[PDB]
Every structure is written in structure tokens, then in C-alpha cells.
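Technical annex B. To support the medicinal chemistry partners, we prepared a structural model of the target in complex with zinc ion, based solely on the information shown next.
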Amino acid sequence: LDSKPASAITAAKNAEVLKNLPFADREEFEAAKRGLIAPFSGQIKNAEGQVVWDMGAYQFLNDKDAADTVNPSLWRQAQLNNIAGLFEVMPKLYQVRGLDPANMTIIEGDSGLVLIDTLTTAETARAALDLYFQHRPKKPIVAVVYSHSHIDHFGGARGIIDEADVKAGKVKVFAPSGFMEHAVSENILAGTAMARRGQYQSGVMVPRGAQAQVDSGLFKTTATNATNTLVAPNVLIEKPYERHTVDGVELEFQLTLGSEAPSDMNIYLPQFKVLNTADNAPPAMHNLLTPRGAEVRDAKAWAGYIDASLEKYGDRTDVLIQQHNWPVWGGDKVRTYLADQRDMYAFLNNRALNLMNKGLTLHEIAAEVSKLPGELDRKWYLRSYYGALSTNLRAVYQRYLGFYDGNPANLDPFPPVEAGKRYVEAMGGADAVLKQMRAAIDKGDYRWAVQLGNHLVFADPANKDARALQADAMEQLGYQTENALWRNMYMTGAMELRHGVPTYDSRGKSEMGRALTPDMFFDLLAIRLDTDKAVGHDMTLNWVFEDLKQDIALTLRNGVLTQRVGSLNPKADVTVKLTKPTLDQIAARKLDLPTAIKQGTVKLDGDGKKLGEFFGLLDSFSPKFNIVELE
Amino acid sequence: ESLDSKPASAITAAKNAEVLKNLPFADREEFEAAKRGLIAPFSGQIKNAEGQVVWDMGAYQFLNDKDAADTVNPSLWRQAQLNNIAGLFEVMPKLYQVRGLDPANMTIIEGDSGLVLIDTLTTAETARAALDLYFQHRPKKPIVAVVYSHSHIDHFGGARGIIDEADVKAGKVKVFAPSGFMEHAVSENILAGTAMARRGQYQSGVMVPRGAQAQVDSGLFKTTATNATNTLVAPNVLIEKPYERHTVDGVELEFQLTLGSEAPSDMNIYLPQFKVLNTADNAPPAMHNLLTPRGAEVRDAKAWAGYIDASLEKYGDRTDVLIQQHNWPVWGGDKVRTYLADQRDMYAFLNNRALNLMNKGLTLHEIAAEVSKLPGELDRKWYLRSYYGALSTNLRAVYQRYLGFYDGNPANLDPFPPVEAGKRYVEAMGGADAVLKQMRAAIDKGDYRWAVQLGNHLVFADPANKDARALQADAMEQLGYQTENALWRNMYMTGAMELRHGVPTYDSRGKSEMGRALTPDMFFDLLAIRLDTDKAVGHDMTLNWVFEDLKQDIALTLRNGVLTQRVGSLNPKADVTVKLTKPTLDQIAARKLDLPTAIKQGTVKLDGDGKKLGEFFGLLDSFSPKFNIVE
Ligand SMILES: [Zn+2]
Ligand SMILES: [Zn+2]
Ligand SMILES: [Zn+2]
Ligand SMILES: [Zn+2]
């Protein structure tokens, strides 16, 4: 069950990467170290004193070369991602990088500060701003820009600003069209599955070191034991291009909806001749299908938004900045970078669509492609460190055709545990599959080894020999892969196969749900509702929010909850009069239902018994289910 | 080893007879609702200009006033029988419907002077035949207005067979359509086309004969129209508001936009004068697809349920008979209200139950195995059965839509392609003969599902094994005899045929002039897909295109074997400039007119390096929609 070292094959495969890849090009090291005002190599702690962010854990990477247990290209990116701290881009324009998965852009301006993004957590947002104030003059925050609907960009808002100031208009908070709908839907409805699957993407439960967690492509790792916030925006960007001025700072926003995020945009600074591309063009291939789980992205639209940014800003930009990683300097280097980025995404879309039309299936296309075309294979900033070329090609297939390959044999597949049992039987039995698994590792075919091991582990997760072997093979795949996310996944996989899921959650301190409208909260309840127990409990529940002047009519039929915003059922079984702050207290589980009834904060008309009944049919989700085993 | 269509096995016949009990059959409400209003039946053929059969109802005679064969699921046979009720039908005086003369229905509203039509069927020949049958029983009048319910070919396809675009452009004929119709009618139906068209052959069962041992029904219709012409006549008046009231020829029409549900450009049509509601394809008497088997982008079940519910609230109390553009009407306010609420609940369940199980850690296939039935009273409704859409497929689809093809388990991070996996598995299972003995055991046992999984591995490892092919075809055929789903029956059957024989020679979209309506940008996106990256590498160039008749300039760029474009732009340093018109571009696209022939003619004038155009066109691949699916 111990962490096995590099096999003969693995070590040879990694040494091969040393040649046939740049390494002699240090342009990225130059671009990352440039502008460094104050480094960061320490820890960021929570209120309870627990570690949130630790850079000191990645010391093994500093000014050294790759171990046999880590792909050299991954090591290169790992080393770059270690360049943390406060950085000047231009006078009045700074950036805090490496104090969180994302970056915070700090624009000076007339009276206060204009911020682009608020990091992932309140503790990191606060620490980034603390490091900035230690070297720059202390001023308030007049404006905030949410580049897009991702938690690493809005998550730390409440740690540095107040909702009260936003609602009053004292602080101007900009966001692209459809932000609220997306910030809450992609991150909470599908939330608990996303948050647990995201643990494989992060490698958070995996220790740091050359035999374990080393990097996450666009950052080191995810923030631990911290608080995630959601402060509703003030001003929404609805036009394809919108110019705005705040505190003597000119901002041109370019809507990039549906590319890296559903609600997304770029921010050009005409006064500074700098372009900020959010996460639309980072120095690694991005995902078209994120491993934590999400809606597929449109590579065609992504390439078109990069190109539209090249045409509109390319001739007007001296330095390109991002919300992940280092800036690219000089108009010519920015123009090459943009065109390469554009080309990479159009290739993913166009080549896949080409091969689909030739009759190739998702996996067939992943095997056929293997490399980016022409000069795209020699660029460090186009490598498969975050997104994967195989995954992305499969994703374009999913997006245009779907999971189903067209072959009727794959029309109704068997679930993991069921397929695993019949395959193990077909393969000769548990011992036979184990001998075959051992042969595959000896050969160095760890890819085939993991396919056998998955069938056995699901057929019987008790087979401790099958588990240890599949973990050993996965570990070797982790030692081999250039992809940081693939490394974090295989590693999280190998650990849990050997041991299991412990006792932890970072989204536990996260009060994301407080920002939610009744309709958003009821959509959560329609998802939380347990169809099996809810069957035969049909009812209608009117809800009236006096503070909101909003009426909502719920209906529970056939164990399915549906709602009508702005309506009231005339023959409703129960009527629930309350306020949003009281609903929030019951949602946060601070205030109890009968406690609220007695208090007077929840007044009921009709069959009052039906509310408690309804709440008794609501499941609770734990984000610690089995992934490599059997829930 | 035999290649003939095997009859029902002992197990299959027993499994089908079991469906007789545990499913209604004693409820004939649908037979009453289909036979009601029958003015004139239709049981004959509709022919093309060349005299070839387009639509044949006489082929489904084996279904009429008889009970199910052992070789067809009794529920599927029930729907098959209903879909045989073809002809002209009165709904109310001045309100008729032509059903069964095409995959879709045509609603004929009388009115003051002429006729107001809702939809124009799939083909010009069917549109003409429907209108012919109507005029044989009703007074001969012009067509004053046409309504396109949504952007699907079975709804606009036959417009040019009964109306003239000259009359539309003049405003003599009012043609209504929901917001974004043109963009969608042309984009979703002409893009990733060749893969879609070939995969659609499995969905259709067009190459499969008719009969109790082969093709019987297509859920929402009998089959697709053959050897016919598909048309596109641009709409006059666009519905842009969520609800729009319009009056034409003394006919009141209230339109409700249902954008993004069953179709991207979609709507319902209420008839305030008649107290009738027309739901297009938004709520048919079968489960619809969230992911169509021919391949497409996933649909939003949440939005779909919301539009059904909005139609229930707005029209439910004002509607006596609900009509549709596929299948029979539902009569009586109470039966319509129950139908709508069941439909709404079915879609919300798909979305909500899947999201529930995803958050509990269940994977796409695990959720398909756990669900099995719709909740409460939804399992006892004939109109909610899996005849078109499938409950398993749709649950898997909701997983794909919110999370994607990848289950989170790293063992499935990089799966082996079909032929590669098949070889390794067959080897692991003992070899070709061993897998064949195991396959034979699975059929004898009646586990045809497991049999097809083994057979797929063998057929892909060696498609020469004629015994493996015949066996997998035999097991698929039994799955087809067993399935309630009409599309699954068409697929397994197409599968069994090609495994035994192979792919023939045919095309119905050959008489269809749909691709003529393509804008230059749409045509260039096709070229970016047709471009062969491998040969195009090292042929970097820029090509300006100018369309005098369109007053539109488009700037192409070929870099690293990737083609990108900018609509409304012109590259100042372009290698070549191509001045032409859309009708001339169309001629070169249709391959009727040649490139140097056009240059000499004067129809294509060139500036700069004229050599680069011919060079560019030489790098373009050609796709054939007759690739192997099961091989
Ligand atoms: Zn992002
Ligand atoms: Zn980010
Ligand atoms: Zn349709
Ligand atoms: Zn239709």
C-alpha cells in the first residue's frame, strides 16, 4: 500500500521529454519574475488559525530539475506557478498572483481602487489586499469587476467589500450578462457532485512532493478550510462591447459569453494599453469539459472571441494580463500569443468535426489526433497542463453528438458494478483478472491495467490486492502525465483505492446560499426533494414574501416539485407568509421550522401540517461519496 | 452462423406477454381520441415527380385491428396502431387536421376568405397530398396565412409545395415564425451534417423493411419520408415578445414563445376563438428526446417543463381540446389539464431526479439503472411512455448536460478506442472461440444485453468473424423484439441488418435544396471543417472575399492548417481577393460550376496571388454519409 517509486519504463519515458521539448527557452521565467515588488512564500490562515493557502509546501520545486516520478514539462509549469506575490504591470496597475488559484488585478485611479476579481476565498482576498497595502497607499474600493461566473473570481468579495455599499451604489460592481443565473446554477444545483469531483481535480487530500501533488496547471492547488462569498453585482454588461468610466479609470468590456464560462468577458484598459482576457486565453490548454463536472464549452465561440479580441485590441495592447498566471509583454508577443490561442481552439472544434464527419467516434478521435498542428506543438503556453487534448476532442464529440457513439451495442450500457462483475467472470475470475493485471504493470501498460482493476474493484471492493494494484498502475500514470489535473486525479485515485475518503469539507465555511432569491432556493428544494418518499404526498404550497412583494406557488405532484414565480394557487393546501431574511435563517439551518411558527416569523393559512411534511421529504447531500469504489 | 431474421425466442415471447398485464391496454381513450373526427381515411401511397414512393401507409397493414406479435413489445404495437389512424379529421367546425400523411401534422384553420395553416409538413409532395385530401372534402380556398410552429424540417419542409415565396415577399400570404427561425432552420440542419445524416439512418429504420419482425413504428410517426423534396420559404412576420396576439382572415392567434425547449426557435399557438391549444412538439403523447440518437446538442428539461407549466397556467382553464403537430388530440379541459401537468412533471423529474442522484454521487449509467420508471401516476400514462425519447438515455443526457461524458473516476479518464479495446478484451476473455462460446451462453440464458457487449468486442477486433457478426445481430434483433422504444427498435434492427450484410446506396436529402440558403459565413465554417489540417500545414495564406450582391466582406486566414474567419472585415495585406456574388458562390459550392471556368467567364475576379485560391480548394476533404457504425 506504500507510494511505489518510478518504474524502469516510467523513468525512461520522462527522461525522453527532456529532449524534443524547449527547456532552453526561459521566456516564461522572465515574464513571471518581471514586476516582482514583494514575494510570497508563506501561509494564509483562517479565523480558527487553520491553514488556507501554503506556498512553503512546494519548496522541493525551487531552482532544481525534475524527479523520475514527475514529467519534466509538468515540473517546468510547477516552477513557474511558484512565482508568487505582488507585481507591478505598469504604474497605477498591480497584480496579486499565487496567493490563491486565481489573480487579483488592482487598478489605482482617482480616489480609491478598482478591482478586477476578488479571488476564491474571503481569507485570500483579504491577504492579497493586505500584501498590496504593505507596499502601496491605503485607499478604499470604489469599484469591483467580476470577469466571469467562477468561484475563483467572485468568492472573496465579502472579505473585502460590503453588500450594503453595493446596494447603495457607493461601490460599483460590474459583471457580464447572466452572472447571477450562472454563478448560482452551475455551482450549487450540481454543487455537491461538482465539489467532491473537484477534489480529484485539486489533489487537496494528496500531500505535496515529487511522489505526490506538485501543481494544478493554472495554479498550485485549491484553497482549504476557507469561506466562499457571493455579493450580487451592481451594473450588468449586456452589449457585446461596453465602455465605462469609474474613478477616472476607463474600462472597455467585451462580452465573451459561453467560452471559458457561460457569463464571461474581457476587460481592455484604453488608458494603459493593457488587455485582460480573464481565463479566456491562459498559458496552458484550457478545458472544454472540466473534470469536476460542468456544461461543455463552445471551442468555435472561444476561438472567435480570442480573434475578436486580437482584431479590436491587438494593435492597441502592449501587455496582456490574465486572472491566472503571468502577463505577456510587447505588442508582437501578445499578437503571436493571441493568434496561437485562437488557432488552438479552432483546431479542436474543426479537426474533431472533420473526423466526426468521417465516422470516427469520441475515443477513436482522441487516439487519432495526439498533437497540435504546425508550430502549436512547440509553444510552452499551448501544452496540455490544465485541459487535455484527448479530453477536449472527446468533449467536441459530446457537445455536437453526445455520449452515445451511434453503435447500438452502447445504447444501454451496464452500470460500473454490474459491468465489472460480468467482465471479471468473462475474464476467468478475480484471480485470473489479478494475474492479467500484474502482467500489464510488468509490461508497462498501466492504461490497460487500470481498466481491469476498475472491473475488479467495482465487482468486489473487498479485494485489497486488486485495489493496491490498480492504485500502483494509476500512480505510474500520474508520474508519467504532463497534465496537472490528470496527475491530481490519478494521485487522488491511488490514495483512496489504498485507504479511502476521510472527514473534511472547505465549502462548509462557505455561505454561498445566502445571496439566493426564493426561486433559486426553491429550485434547490426541487433537487433536494426525495421522489421516492415524496410519492403520495401531493400538495400545493403558496409562499408570500412581504419584504419582497413576491408571491410564489409551489406544487408537489408525483414526487416532483414545480414552481410558478408571481403566481398564487387559489386552492392551495397551505400559505406561507414570511420574509427573505427569515427564509434565509431556515435555509442556513440556524432557525428551526416550529420555532419560527411559534415566534410569529412564519405565519400559516390552511393546512399548516403540510409545511413540516414538505420539509421532511427533503434530502441532505454530503460531498464525500465514493468515486473509485461504490457510493 | 445463420443470417436470416430469427423469430421470437422462448424468453422474448414470455417477456412480451408479461407486458400485457402491468400496463393499461383496458384504457382505449387514445384509440377513441385518434378515431374521433375522422372525415376521410388515408391508407395509400404518395409518389415523387419521378413516380417513386415518398410515403406508404399500406406497408403497415399487419398492425390493423389485431394484437401484438411475439416479435414486438405490446406497448410499442399499441403506439404503432394509433399512428396508423391517418387522414383528414375535424377537431371543431372550421378546424381540421391532416395526420399520418407525413412524420408531422398540418393544422388547417378555415377563416373569413382563405386558409390559415399551422405547419407545412416535411416534404413538398406530402404538403401537396395533405392539402389535396383536405380539398376533396372541404371548399377550395387560397392560403392567406402560414404558421411555422418551430425550426424543424418536418414543420417548414413542404412550404414551397403549396405556397410561393413571391406571394410571401409581396405580403399576400402572412408567414409567422418564432424569434431566430432563419438562423436555426439553416444552422442546426446544415452544419455537422454528414455524421448526423448517417446516424439518423439508425434512428429512422428507413433501410429496414416493414413488418412484425422488422420496422413497425417511429413513436411520434411511422417512419421518415423517402425520395422527397425539402423546402425553406422565409417567414414574413417574426414573433419576438413572450406572448403575441395576431389576427388574420378573422382568425385570432395568440403565440407563446417556448425558445430552447424541443427546438431553439419554438412556440405554442392558442386559438382564443376555438378554445383549442396547439403545443407544436412541446408535449407529444410519448417521451421526447433530451439527446436525439442521430446526434445533437443536449436540450434543457428544466426550461421545457417551465414552458409546459406556463402553457398550463395561461391556457389550461381556457382550453377544451389540445392539438399537436405530431399525433392525436386530447379532448376535455380536465383531460388536457392532467395531460399538461403530467408532461410538465415528466420533464422536471428528468432534470431534478438526475441532479438529485448526481449530488449523491451516482454516475450516468448508475442513474439509468436506478431509475427504471417515472414516479407516482406517471408510470400508468400511455402518453408518457418511452416510445421516442428514452428514460435511460434522457437521464444519461441530464448527466452529460450538467457534468459531461466523464464520470469522475480516473480509470475512465482515457478509454481505449473500440477496435483497440475489443482486441485486448477478447484476448483477456480467452480468445475469439472462448468469447463466441460465452456469447452463445448469454443468448441461451436470454441475457442479450451482455451478449451484444461481447459481440461488439469481437466484431471490432476482427469484423471478418462471420459467426460473431451473426450472433451479435441475433442478440440485437431480440433486444429490438423486446424494446418499447420505437427509435431503439429502429436502431437495433438497422444494427442487426448491417452486421449481417452491410451498408447499401441511397439519399432523400438529394432532392432537397436546403443548402442553397447558406450565408457565406456558414459556407466558410463548413470549409474550416472540410479543410485537411495534415496537407494544409505549410500552406499559410489569407484570402479576402467580397460579395457585391450582399455588400458583405469576409476575411479568411489559413494558419497552421487551421482556417479562421472575420465577417465584415478585410485583411489589408491579403494574399488573394475574391470578388463574386452569392449565386455564383452557390454554383461553385454545388459543384455545378468549376473554379477556372468561373475565372474565365468573369463571374470570379481575382486581385493578388490568384494561384492561392485553387491551392486553398485543393486542401478541402469530401465527406460521404455511409461510414460503418457497427464495424
Ligand atoms: Zn474561470
Ligand atoms: Zn479562474
Ligand atoms: Zn420538432
Ligand atoms: Zn416535429
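Notes passed to the chemistry partners:
The CA atoms of residues 229 and 511 of chain B lie 5 Å apart.
The pocket of zinc ion (ligand 2) is lined by residues A 102, 150, 152-153, 279, 323-324 (CB under 6 Å).
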